[PDB]
Design a protein around this ligand. Sequence first.
Ligand code: NAP
Ligand code: NAP
Ligand code: 5SD
Ligand code: AOX
Lengths: 325, 325
Amino acid sequence: SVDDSKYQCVKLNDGHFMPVLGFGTYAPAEVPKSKALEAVKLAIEAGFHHIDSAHVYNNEEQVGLAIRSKIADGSVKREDIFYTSKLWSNSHRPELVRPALERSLKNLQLDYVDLYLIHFPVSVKPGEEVIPKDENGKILFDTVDLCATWEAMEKCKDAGLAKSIGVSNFNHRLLEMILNKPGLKYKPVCNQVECHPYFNQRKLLDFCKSKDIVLVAYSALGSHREEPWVDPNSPVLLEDPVLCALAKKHKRTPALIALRYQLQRGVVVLAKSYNEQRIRQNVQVFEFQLTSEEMKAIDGLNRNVRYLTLDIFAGPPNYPFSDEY
Amino acid sequence: SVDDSKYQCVKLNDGHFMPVLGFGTYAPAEVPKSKALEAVKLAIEAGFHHIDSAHVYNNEEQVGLAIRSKIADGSVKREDIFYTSKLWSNSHRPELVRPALERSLKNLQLDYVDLYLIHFPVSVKPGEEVIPKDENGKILFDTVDLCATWEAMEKCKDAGLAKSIGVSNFNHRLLEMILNKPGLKYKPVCNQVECHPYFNQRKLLDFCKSKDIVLVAYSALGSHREEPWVDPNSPVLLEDPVLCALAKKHKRTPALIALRYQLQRGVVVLAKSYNEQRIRQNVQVFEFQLTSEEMKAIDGLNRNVRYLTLDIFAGPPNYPFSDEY
Ligand SMILES: NC(=O)c1ccc[n+]([C@@H]2O[C@H](COP(=O)([O-])OP(=O)(O)OC[C@H]3O[C@@H](n4cnc5c(N)ncnc54)[C@H](OP(=O)(O)O)[C@@H]3O)[C@@H](O)[C@H]2O)c1
Ligand SMILES: NC(=O)c1ccc[n+]([C@@H]2O[C@H](COP(=O)([O-])OP(=O)(O)OC[C@H]3O[C@@H](n4cnc5c(N)ncnc54)[C@H](OP(=O)(O)O)[C@@H]3O)[C@@H](O)[C@H]2O)c1
Ligand SMILES: C[C@]12CCC(=O)C[C@@H]1CC[C@@H]1[C@@H]2CC[C@]2(C)C(=O)CC[C@@H]12
Ligand SMILES: C[C@]12CC[C@H](O)C[C@@H]1CC[C@@H]1[C@@H]2CC[C@]2(C)C(=O)CC[C@@H]12
């Protein structure tokens, strides 16, 4: 249609530009990986320019192939795709960071990722098991200085393997640990965290904005709800009457209201869908705007509901969700 | 620059994209119209991608030479410049709209403008005089249905002469008159109006966002303060003590705080400067962010100061500033 050469982005603190709507690629293991290949191709056709994955999603072969397929048919150029990967917690030791990035890049068959994140701040012992456990099912925790992990991330950006580097699931204290590290070369460009109208992350968002860190929202639609990661008793975000009222007023959908909320408060928003219609629906976030009154109504929904506690990882001080923010 | 091929823009309701920081080109009458040439070149070199002018500014020859110079020297391509002109009030009759646009294009030596606006909703008699007057010195107003003016603007867009069309200095009533016009083809993409912390336009802004009309703020730095247009005893925006204290806290400037405020509330902001350092300074709006409490402090500065009343045009029903908004 009218002008597909341009799209909305935000300038990161390292000078790179991030598209403000990202396509989420995680799906529960029961969904065939074929659907990831299909869905990324559809997302790129629909106008997503930012694609979010991770080693632990076990889909980088498919996601990379979808990107390469869309480049080879002329649909998009590599410069106009912003691809994120993440370093899993079995590779936090500094000597394991670049090996893990190179392994992701070999799976993707890409030369570089646009963004590499520390996925989660609790370290687990190295090896092929992504969640290694003892005989009673308790995680095997590892002891790693994330400031040393971050210096290994910085060397990946100097090597050109990652254009930008950031973090995910960090709280205030862990962000200050990085920002205050002696000899810091690059600040994180982003903190990717759960964020939606039931857990709007006000306080953490303000801190990130005070440092020119972009907050990137995952579970912006209320999450995948996969058991046993998400409590099935938790409220379903998109049933909320305020979201539904706003959707009816705008002739949009609750999902669109939840995405647009994030864009207007300065957050970069992810959205996963493997459904062709809903992929195309989600790019309609650029076709309407919420009034101040509507933003205030959504701010009023905040209610302390964290879908993704990751509490199997609790105990070490780097477990990020016990602090206020 | 790390990546000067990307820059922050917003999608308009016609599918075109507008860069969110625009360069203002009006300068008071004591400044030679020639000075616009260098200023616009320096704006483009600094990273402005949106340049705002108008037939009545008497600078489109210079503005157009600057734009063509920076294309010819390889600094930017035409698709990375978003240029706005405006239809003066002696050309509101529908028969006269296209003629006026063609005259601006001949002066610019461009094939199209990216945006053509109705400059001000009060019509004056057609002819060479921009402010025609009778023998007693009274302005000669003209009775024109701006719906018919708008249909002529629609035809300019269909001809390709304007990629997008919008309005300026419209109030709620006048916007509604356009949006409710029978047989409307294209909504206005924007309403360019005075907007700054002393006149934050909340109500009109919300109305525009409810219709997916972008509000574009002029006089965002407190205006050119040219007599007789602006009263010299109006308060000087950039001396405001809250803006100055936020500037000192951020190691920025009061101008930068006023520009960033607008970006965060979803406004596209203009900034005129003919000073090389200030032009470069203003592009730093993309380098920092304001917290929610800082935004609320700036919201609290609102105080009903309209610098540009343009009351020479008061009397006709279309004069826009007698209604509440
Ligand atoms: N960094 C981390 O630790 C972390 C954690 C979680 C997620 N993430 C990233 O963020 C992404 C998004 O978060 P998420 O996977 O929790 O899910 P999400 O984006 O909050 O929601 C996905 C759910 O919403 C549905 N959906 C999507 N569009 C919809 C629409 N327009 N209307 C109604 N329902 C809609 C999806 O179903 P369909 O697919 O059937 O449309 C899926 O069931 C992930 O895929 C991943 O890339 C990161
Ligand atoms: N649609 C309309 O009816 C309408 C009305 C008015 C304006 N406009 C458009 O909006 C543009 C901007 O509005 P405006 O001309 O009233 O002025 P403005 O952008 O509010 O600026 C006022 C003044 O600020 C000074 N300045 C600029 N940057 C500065 C900085 N970083 N620190 C300190 N001072 C700074 C400039 O002086 P220096 O040049 O010396 O830096 C300028 O004179 C116009 O030029 C025009 O393009 C449209
Ligand atoms: C389920 C799965 C992904 C698939 C798998 O084989 C096991 C692994 C366990 C860890 C999970 C991960 C999905 C993404 C999750 C949910 C996180 O973001 C933190 C822990 C992650
Ligand atoms: C542009 C503007 C000067 C800046 C104001 O913000 C808007 C004014 C519109 C009317 C213009 C005027 C400059 C002087 C003009 C151009 C005239 O000579 C007669 C009409 C006058």
